Design a protein around this nucleic acid. Structure first.
Ligand SMILES: [K+]
Ligand SMILES: [K+]
Ligand SMILES: [K+]
Ligand SMILES: [K+]
Ligand SMILES: [K+]
Ligand SMILES: [K+]
Ligand SMILES: [K+]
Ligand SMILES: [K+]
Ligand SMILES: [K+]
Ligand SMILES: [K+]
Ligand SMILES: [K+]
Ligand SMILES: [K+]
Ligand SMILES: [K+]
Ligand SMILES: [K+]
Ligand SMILES: [K+]
Ligand SMILES: [K+]
Ligand SMILES: [K+]
Ligand SMILES: [K+]
Ligand SMILES: [K+]
Ligand SMILES: [K+]
Ligand SMILES: [K+]
Ligand SMILES: [K+]
Ligand SMILES: [K+]
Ligand SMILES: [K+]
Ligand SMILES: [K+]
Ligand SMILES: [K+]
Ligand SMILES: [K+]
Ligand SMILES: [K+]
Ligand SMILES: [K+]
Ligand SMILES: [K+]
Ligand SMILES: [K+]
Ligand SMILES: [K+]
Ligand SMILES: [K+]
Ligand SMILES: [K+]
Ligand SMILES: [Mg+2]
Ligand SMILES: [Mg+2]
Ligand SMILES: [Mg+2]
Ligand SMILES: [Mg+2]
Ligand SMILES: [Mg+2]
Ligand SMILES: [Mg+2]
Ligand SMILES: [Mg+2]
Ligand SMILES: [Mg+2]
Ligand SMILES: [Mg+2]
Ligand SMILES: [Mg+2]
Ligand SMILES: [Mg+2]
Ligand SMILES: [Mg+2]
Ligand SMILES: [Mg+2]
Ligand SMILES: [Mg+2]
Ligand SMILES: [Mg+2]
Ligand SMILES: [Mg+2]
Ligand SMILES: [Mg+2]
Ligand SMILES: [Mg+2]
Ligand SMILES: [Mg+2]
Ligand SMILES: [Mg+2]
Ligand SMILES: [Mg+2]
Ligand SMILES: [Mg+2]
Ligand SMILES: [Mg+2]
Ligand SMILES: [Mg+2]
Ligand SMILES: [Mg+2]
Ligand SMILES: [Mg+2]
Ligand SMILES: [Mg+2]
Ligand SMILES: [Mg+2]
Ligand SMILES: [Mg+2]
Ligand SMILES: [Mg+2]
Ligand SMILES: [Mg+2]
Ligand SMILES: [Mg+2]
Ligand SMILES: [Mg+2]
Ligand SMILES: [Mg+2]
Ligand SMILES: [Mg+2]
Ligand SMILES: [Mg+2]
Ligand SMILES: [Mg+2]
Ligand SMILES: [Mg+2]
Ligand SMILES: [Mg+2]
Ligand SMILES: [Mg+2]
Ligand SMILES: [Mg+2]
Ligand SMILES: [Mg+2]
Ligand SMILES: [Mg+2]
Ligand SMILES: [Mg+2]
Ligand SMILES: [Mg+2]
Lengths: 61, 101
RNA sequence: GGAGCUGUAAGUAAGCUAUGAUCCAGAGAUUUCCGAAUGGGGGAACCCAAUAUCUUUUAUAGGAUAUUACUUUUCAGUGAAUACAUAGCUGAUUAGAGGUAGACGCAGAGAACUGAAACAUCUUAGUACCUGCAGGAAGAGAAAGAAAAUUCGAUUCCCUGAGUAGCGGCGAGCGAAACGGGAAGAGCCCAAACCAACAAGCUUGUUGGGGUUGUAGGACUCCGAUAUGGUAGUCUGUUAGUAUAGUUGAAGGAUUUGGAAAAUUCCGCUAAAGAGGGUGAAAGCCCCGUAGACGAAAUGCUGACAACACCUAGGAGGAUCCUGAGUACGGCGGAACACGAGAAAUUCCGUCGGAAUCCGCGGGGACCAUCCCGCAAGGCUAAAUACUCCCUAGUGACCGAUAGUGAACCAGUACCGUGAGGGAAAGGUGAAAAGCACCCCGGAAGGGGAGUGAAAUAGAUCCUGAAACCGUGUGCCUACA
RNA sequence: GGUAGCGGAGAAAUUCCAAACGAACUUGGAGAUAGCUGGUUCUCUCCGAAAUAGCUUUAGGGCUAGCCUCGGAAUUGAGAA
RNA sequence: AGGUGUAGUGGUAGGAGAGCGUUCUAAGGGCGUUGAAGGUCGAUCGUGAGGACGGCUGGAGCGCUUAGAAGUGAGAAUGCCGGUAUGAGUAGCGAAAGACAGGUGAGAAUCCUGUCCACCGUAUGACUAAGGUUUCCUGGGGAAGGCUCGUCCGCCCAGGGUUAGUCGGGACCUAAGCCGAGGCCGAUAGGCGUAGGCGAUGGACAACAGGUUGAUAUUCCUGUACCAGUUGUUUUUGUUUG
RNA sequence: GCUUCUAGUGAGAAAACAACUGCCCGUACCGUAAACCGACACAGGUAGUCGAGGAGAGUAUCCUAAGGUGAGCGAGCGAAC
RNA sequence: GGUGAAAUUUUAGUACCUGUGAAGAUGCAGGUUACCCGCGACAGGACGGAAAGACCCCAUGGAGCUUUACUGUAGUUUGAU
């Protein structure tokens, strides 16, 4: 799935609201990036949210 | 059933009330029994049964087992049956007199 | 369990059974092929292989059994670009893969008709539908709570609060919560400091100890006891009970009517049993039962008891150390809160920014101060609650075959449809077949006799047998209206 | 053999998509909604209308009033001719 | 309790009141094989819904009183289901040639046989794929089905029938397309796709003629072949410069 | 499939003759139809092969061959329409 | 001779004229005509049958279509991050 490998962030549904407050369904997606991380000793390209990378505790080898 | 093949029974209800006979066959699933000389029927048989005239055959038809009371062999009277253990053999006892079977 | 049995279903046939059959209950054995299917393939119930062992034939062909899907977990072995490696690859190991009960639970995603007497906010609804994950229940749960009578002391559910406070094109509508009363009740484990061991590049991981919180707790430093209590542990036995077959179980004869008695009349009797069913009509005393007493080889289930395992320290000190960060929180955009952005607290999602840390932090419905109450960013937890495809025993001022399940009957059948799917009609002879031998007309069908039966105008299209409709007989009337 | 309904396909006709296609079929929401039309089952007794006003996205709908009915209270009798 | 007097008593929508009848419940009190309910008939009673009483039928149940609860009353919904009418003995009996003799039989325009006649003949003949799925053959049958009839039938009953190394398919091949280890993508579900496969309508591939049965035949049989392979016999040549 | 080429694989090969082995599925019947699709023993629809003679260009046409068929209501009458 | 439907149908012993009447009557009024039952024919009437008019209007019905109607929105594009 298109899911943040570390924090679990994923696509969800939200509402568009117009000025008249009309409601239509929209998707709301996380800021996922393909990043090479050292998962269990091996580099691999996994989806990672920019939020999980913000701290610098996630490898960027 | 409380009555068994070979038993001597007395008819307590029916057209043949007070007749007595031996049980020729018992039908436990039907709760019925055949008694000699009781509930005879006249059957109109086609001769396809090895009887080269057909004829009207007299046979005993079954009667309900509750229309029959077992005869006390030692007493000749009809009696209700109790189950008392004798010699470790569970047997039928004449409620009226205490005789077995 | 104790005399018959070989199902519905007769019939013939051939058999079984007191050396205990059929039947009943517990436990096992067998269990073809398809189907997740899984050696490969495939238009399900078929086809075609590999490897090993065995077997058939002189031999080839033939047959049998076993193993061989995929991914996951761990281990081993091989092993690329590429040096060491890693990936890949082979084997082993380990675990999932589908179905349901058309119910109940949680979560993702999410309508519309509809209401608003139109309609975009709103409503219908977070409903229907779809999808994931479940569990016997789920979810919630051990206060960064409810409060301000001064206090309460986890959660859940019921009553009430209350159609109140509120929300709302302030329309239509939506609609709490706390207190109070009940059901049921239960609490616990981690992370960190610190200590010890090991391994590695003075820290930096693994293991074990330690520790668990708000009248702040713990580490730490002092002393002092190795007790006392508890449990939401285990196919640990033992024991009892219990479920799944059963045994036993009172007391009526005549008379009248009738085909038949249980009806009737006459006298009796039994009752810890006068619930109910059956029996040739309506039976406490004929049968099955009922009240009551009694019963378990086997396998479950439950409760104890024992065993074993697992938890469980008091008090005084604060110098220092610890107490969950990309977290809390904020901006922006959505959502959830009864609460529609609103003056909008509280909770959550996306995005960006982004704290303090006990002299701290959060909440008390914008916000600030004060006071009070709590201590988030870690997890677990029985009961009270929801539901019933099934199983056992019952109940009904529920139905009685156009009803009651669609289906009382060989019904999800026949039948319709390419398919998804739609979906019927159809119960009753008689007490017993005693289901009309034989005769007569007829090719038969069908009748007429003769019989059976209480009755056949009960003859199988069989209880009763309405009406429409069709016919036969004829008392009266009818061919100038 | 492929394309499927918020669609496909169309030398283009709103043409075809299993004998009715301006949008298939089936099941479900679902007993959609219907200010409309139709239907609504025994009896007798007492009384007995209206088809008007006002307002209405109202005009064959509705609401209050008027007119009917039932019960009740009460007054110096307030009604009618 | 009733009596007198006066007055009143048409009625849709609709209001009020009081009752009839249906099934069930409770209690009481009863009736039933000396015949319950139901059905049917009758010249019966009450102000109404309706209520009795007899005869016949029927064969087991059912009233009455008081109170209770209701799936409680049908003639209309182009209502639903069933039955049966009307139109009617009417329309229709589905594109065409038959005739007679003899037979069979209870019965024949309609079945069998014969004769002549007529019709199709790039067919109305002969094969075969699909589809159907027992309809094939033999012996019986005449309820239903057959648009009439029926002794007959693609119907019913009872038996039987499909034989291959060479035909067509598989153990061969691939096309379109489909599936798809890992893989890529995506709220879920899943979508796509590599290796690898599946998949003919195409490629490849060894026998024919005749005979035979009521029903099968390039399948059985006869004759004569072919393809792949197996065992053995003889003959040649090669044993690791093979 | 087949034919070649070496790489590899090899102790045995080949010929003649004799004897012998060769699995599964379909294989009835209808099939311009009364037995298929059309609710029907329905004047429709149903791919491919063979499809003769005279006259003829011909598979047209007419009549015929091999072969198949007389077709599932009839008998009269010989009006209107 | 055999076999045998259907639409329709409130019950029907189902005439004519003039009139009447929801304004076009087999059925009402007045008068007139007409013995009873059929068969073959024809269609003037039964405002004949068939279809809950399609034209017309209406329902704060529906659907498809259009646009500089309203409100949204896929897509496209521009900036910030
Ligand atoms: K499978
Ligand atoms: K269920
Ligand atoms: K809406
Ligand atoms: K409305
Ligand atoms: K839980
Ligand atoms: K309320
Ligand atoms: K409104
Ligand atoms: K501890
Ligand atoms: K009896
Ligand atoms: K009894
Ligand atoms: K036990
Ligand atoms: K808010
Ligand atoms: K608070
Ligand atoms: K608090
Ligand atoms: K009878
Ligand atoms: K008559
Ligand atoms: K076209
Ligand atoms: K009033
Ligand atoms: K009567
Ligand atoms: K009706
Ligand atoms: K009819
Ligand atoms: K008729
Ligand atoms: K025959
Ligand atoms: K073959
Ligand atoms: K082929
Ligand atoms: K064959
Ligand atoms: K010629
Ligand atoms: K020709
Ligand atoms: K014929
Ligand atoms: K004529
Ligand atoms: K004419
Ligand atoms: K009129
Ligand atoms: K006419
Ligand atoms: K339309
Ligand atoms: Mg398999
Ligand atoms: Mg509305
Ligand atoms: Mg007893
Ligand atoms: Mg008695
Ligand atoms: Mg809200
Ligand atoms: Mg806050
Ligand atoms: Mg935020
Ligand atoms: Mg406090
Ligand atoms: Mg619980
Ligand atoms: Mg039913
Ligand atoms: Mg009935
Ligand atoms: Mg039904
Ligand atoms: Mg009778
Ligand atoms: Mg009858
Ligand atoms: Mg006259
Ligand atoms: Mg006269
Ligand atoms: Mg047009
Ligand atoms: Mg069409
Ligand atoms: Mg709804
Ligand atoms: Mg009046
Ligand atoms: Mg009057
Ligand atoms: Mg009754
Ligand atoms: Mg009713
Ligand atoms: Mg009716
Ligand atoms: Mg006619
Ligand atoms: Mg014909
Ligand atoms: Mg000709
Ligand atoms: Mg021609
Ligand atoms: Mg035949
Ligand atoms: Mg035959
Ligand atoms: Mg016939
Ligand atoms: Mg082949
Ligand atoms: Mg794919
Ligand atoms: Mg995969
Ligand atoms: Mg490929
Ligand atoms: Mg070949
Ligand atoms: Mg043949
Ligand atoms: Mg053949
Ligand atoms: Mg045809
Ligand atoms: Mg007039
Ligand atoms: Mg007139
Ligand atoms: Mg008249
Ligand atoms: Mg008059
Ligand atoms: Mg008309
Ligand atoms: Mg209309």
């Amino acid at each position: 799935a298109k899911v943040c490998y570390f924090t679990g962030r994923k696509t969800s549904s939200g509402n568009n609201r117009s000025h008249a407050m009309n409601s239509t369904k929209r998707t709301v997606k996380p800021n996922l990036q393909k990043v090479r991380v050292l998962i269990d000793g091996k580099p691999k390209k996994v989806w990672v949210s920019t939020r999980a990378l913000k701290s610098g505790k996630i490898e960027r080898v | 059933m409380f009555v068994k093949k070979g038993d001597k029974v007395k008819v307590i209800t029916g057209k043949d009330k007070n007749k007595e006979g031996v049980v020729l066959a018992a039908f436990p699933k039907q709760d019925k029994v055949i008694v000699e000389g009781v509930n005879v029927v006249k059957k109109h048989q086609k001769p396809n049964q090895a009887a080269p005239q057909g004829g009207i055959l007299e046979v005993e038809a079954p009667i309900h087992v509750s229309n029959v009371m077992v005869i006390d062999p030692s007493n000749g009277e009809a009696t209700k049956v109790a189950f008392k253990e004798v010699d470790g053999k569970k047997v039928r006892v004449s409620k009226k007199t205490g005789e077995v079977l």
